[PDB]
């Protein structure tokens, strides 16, 4: 589990969204596994605005932050997981690393802020849903 809290936005994995998320929807995209809902309280996370390919992600199933290199956001074929069939997922970045279903929502961060959240795992790869292209999270 995990979310990003920026401005009056809450960013979560679409497969972990709550009724309150859907009842306060801003934007959602199944192909990216992302959903954004509106918040009453201001959040303090900064979204990275950059093309970094190195950062650190949180792996809840190891209670550890791991430094990783990660790929550019792309359309990646993902094997079946407990929450999606095998499919193409968009805006996805991969690294070599550990990722269980419970690790979804862990933050990937670089020197510029939050890059994305854990979304996929298996075959010794961890996939992160990028948020750096969602420039509107920074305003309004």
Q: Which are the catalytic amino acids?
A: 15, 33, 104
48 binds Zn ion (CB under 5 A): yes
Q: For residue 70, give Cα distances in angstroms to 43, 63, 75, 110.
A: 26, 20, 14, 11
Q: For residue 110, give Cα distances in angstroms to 49, 91, 107.
A: 10, 17, 10
- Which part of the chain contacts Zn ion (CB under 5 A), choosing from 25-33, 45-53, 71-79, 121-129? 45-53
Question: Taking Cα atoms as reference points, which of 43, 45, 39 lies closest to residue 20?
Answer: 39
- Which part of the chain contacts Zn ion (CB under 5 A), choosing from 5-13, 40-48, 56-64, 116-124? 40-48
128 neighbors 118 (Cβ within 8 angstroms) = yes
**In sequence order, which residues have a C-beta less than 8 Å from that of residue 61 and are 6 or more positions away?**
98, 99, 100, 102, 103
Least separation, in Å, of the C-beta of 115 and Zn ion? 7
Among 15, 26, 29, 52, binds Zn ion (CB under 5 A): 52
Number of residues engaging Zn ion in binding (CB under 5 A): 5
**DSSP-assigned beta bridge partners for residue 4:** 11
Among 6, 95, 107, 110, binds Zn ion (CB under 5 A): 110
Least separation, in Å, of the C-beta of 52 and Zn ion? 3
**Residue 59 or 93: which CB sits closer to Zn ion?**
93
Distance, CA of 22 to CA of 117 (rounded, Å)? 19
E strand or H helix at 1, and its extent? none
Least separation, in Å, of the C-beta of 110 and Zn ion? 3
For the annotated binding site for Zn(2+), the residues are: 50, 52, 110, 112
Binding residues for Zn ion, per CB under 5 A? 48, 50, 52, 110, 112
């Amino acid at each position: 589990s995990g979310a990003i809290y920026v401005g009056n936005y809450r960013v979560v994995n679409r497969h972990l969204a709550t009724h309150n998320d859907w009842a306060n929807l801003v934007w959602e995209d199944s192909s990216r596994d992302l959903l954004v809902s509106s918040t009453t309280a201001q959040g303090c996370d900064t979204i990275a605005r950059c093309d970094c390919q190195t950062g650190v992600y949180y792996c809840s199933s190891r209670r550890k932050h791991y430094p990783v290199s990660f790929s550019k956001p792309s359309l990646i074929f993902v094997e079946a997981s407990e929450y999606y069939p095998a499919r193409y997922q968009s805006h996805l970045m991969l690294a070599v690393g550990h990722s269980e279903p419970g690790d979804c929502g862990g933050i990937l961060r670089c020197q510029h802020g939050v890059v994305g959240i854990v979304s996929t795992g298996g075959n010794g790869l961890v996939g992160f849903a990028d948020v750096r292209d969602l420039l509107w999270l920074d305003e309004e």
